[PDB]
Amino acid sequence: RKDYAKLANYDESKVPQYTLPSVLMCHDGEMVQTKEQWEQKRRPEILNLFTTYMFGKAPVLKHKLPCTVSRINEKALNGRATRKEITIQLTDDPQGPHIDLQLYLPNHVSGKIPVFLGISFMPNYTIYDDPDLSVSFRGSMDKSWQLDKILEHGYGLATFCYNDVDPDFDDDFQNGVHPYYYEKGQNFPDPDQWGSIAAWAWGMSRAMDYLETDKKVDAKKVAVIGHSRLGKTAVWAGASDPRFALVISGNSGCCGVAISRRCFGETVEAMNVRFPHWFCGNYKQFNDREKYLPFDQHELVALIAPRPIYIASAEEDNWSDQKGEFLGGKGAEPVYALYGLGGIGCEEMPPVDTPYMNGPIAYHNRKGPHAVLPYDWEQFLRFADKYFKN
Amino acid sequence: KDYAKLANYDESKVPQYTLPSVLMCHDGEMVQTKEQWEQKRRPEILNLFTTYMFGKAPVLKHKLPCTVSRINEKALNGRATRKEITIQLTDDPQGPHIDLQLYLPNHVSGKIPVFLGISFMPNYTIYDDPDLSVSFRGSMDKSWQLDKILEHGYGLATFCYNDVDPDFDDDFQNGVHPYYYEKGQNFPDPDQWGSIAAWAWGMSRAMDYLETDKKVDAKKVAVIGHSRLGKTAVWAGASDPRFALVISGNSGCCGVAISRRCFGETVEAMNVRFPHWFCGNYKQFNDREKYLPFDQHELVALIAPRPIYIASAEEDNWSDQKGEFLGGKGAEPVYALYGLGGIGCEEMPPVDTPYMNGPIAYHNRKGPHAVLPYDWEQFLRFADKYFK
Ligand SMILES: O=C(O)[C@H]1O[C@@H](O)[C@H](O)[C@@H](O)[C@H]1O
């Protein structure tokens, strides 16, 4: 039951030499130098590699799942906001698992409204100290959602607790949604089928299915966001569902946007051993075999192109590998160029509290711990404004 | 990391496990007819071994050039013919090739059954045959017993596995693997052949010759291998149904031994000490035998209804002798679809007590991890029942 935190390299001068797999080079050798070759041949190859070998295939539905608007409050924050609560039935079982989506929209705004779709560690009461909710404690996670700031910009926020989809604990997938999608002769996901992170991501796509039917939400302006293991999830939700307009990776780190081949802080083995439920079976083959990965996480960031992404790091989060987060963005730059979009705007990793967001890939590494703080939201909304407003 | 110190050899300490049901299809259908087995269940299981354990080998639209580069009808002082077939493994003739050595017994009525062996060493080690030259001539004789095979009216074909792919982790830069990549590929895909898949494919190229031979009974070629080449011999038998009988010499871990027993050698011990043996995908089952979508009783089931002999050795605790027997035991429900019996006992037999009156033979013999004369006595008694 090893503690991988002690065994990990954090010494930049002891990172092994490595070659990144070429994002632009198709499996048959053909290089991409056109968005059309990208969209038609290469992006599908990479999308297939990540689905087969890392996240795993989630169920594809023939119809949108049943959902209800079970409560509406049009005067939710002394009239500043409409709060809706939407129950999304994930299975054929009405007594089975549901998303309890909580949507805040600002009042006194005329258009359709851009929305942050976030996924939370804790129930919806923890997002805002909202005096029309009951019971951590009410608004205990406000720092990490900054709903006042989101409302100030004329955007909304929709969140649900990831536990709603799949409990985050290694119960060999007898709980959550997995078992409801097994075949009659299957007690476990196949090696190429979804683990937990893919289930949570699929979760966000079922939330987006509701959102595009909400008259007040701008379906063309939905940002996905999540922190840490839910960072990983948000980036996959963005990669695997192109309806999301903008993707926010909050210290996603290892198997997020960090480059695995650096073997800095958290590694694939640390990851799969501690969290066997997170990724598909296929992915456990890469435990301390990073060099044999058919891809690296720069290719995951490449699946967001041309759409914008904000990669945020924390100065104290060496576990997440802040330089490797930066280099995962750097590595996607060649694909954004096919679309005539610039890069991050700097060659080497910038110093602390130095945001770059003038390109389609934004980056900062902020002072303090592994978290989403007001600082982070400050930059996220500045970046969102560039796309969601004129 | 040493794996010798982590090995359980204590039968009382073997963990709880469920064998994955060999007769339950992925979609739920229970197999109770050999038709459902052949049309549905077997294809599913073969695909799982191919994709997740051994790795997909190239399928060829037509055979490769073979050439009989020397015969001698009077070999071993008249007793046998010796043939030397070269076998191209590629379009390129300067590419890798198999040096196939075949001995056929002189003056026998009818086409001859052949044991297709794959050997650790070059062919001159199989017998002290003066017509050869030079791990010296005759070294492996003890493990091949040509005299006894000839005496039975059977011959013996052998090539050294080094001909097809070297036994060491070179990232598949040597051997056959490079000659089948596609532009933009330095390395097999995770679902593609490693060295056991290549060595097994090797024995398929050897059979591709053996059938064309006019003195060979191509409906009566056995496959035999010891140890890592015993794991190869089973996969050969499973992924090429032309072979008539399969001989597992101490195949052990990722041969016929039940992976879920974690007795002696484990999957992690194997993939970590021999990264090149199995496909990339198989490395995902390190310390995760609970989560294999199969176990080795299903690999044995791919032989059915063709017979198979599982030989264990008493000192070879590493191979898990009881789990080898239980790989056989667990196949019996598929052989039963073909109105065939099982091994013939419930508990693992005592030492030097062969059971070979069903389509699955088992013996645990005295002494070390090896192929010994005793083993061949029993392999030939078994072959006699299907080959006379
Ligand atoms: O004897 C040998 O060299 C090999 O035998 C095999 O059956 C076993 O899987 C290997 O670990 C090694 O023991």
Author numbering:
A (entry chain A): 26 to 160, 172 to 426
B (entry chain B): 27 to 160, 172 to 425
Paper text:
Glucuronoyl esterases from carbohydrate esterase family 15 (CE15) have been proposed as an aid in reducing this recalcitrance by cleaving ester bonds found between lignin and glucuronoxylan. Only PvCE15 proved amenable to crystallization, and its structure was solved both as an apo protein and in complex with GlcA and GalA, respectively. PvCE15 has an α-/β-hydrolase fold like previously determined CE15 structures, consisting of a three-layer sandwich with a solvent-exposed cleft comprising the active site. The catalytic triad (Asp353-His406-Ser264) and oxyanion-stabilizing arginine (Arg265, oxyanion hole), whose positions and roles have been established in previous work on CE15 GEs, are conserved in PvCE15.
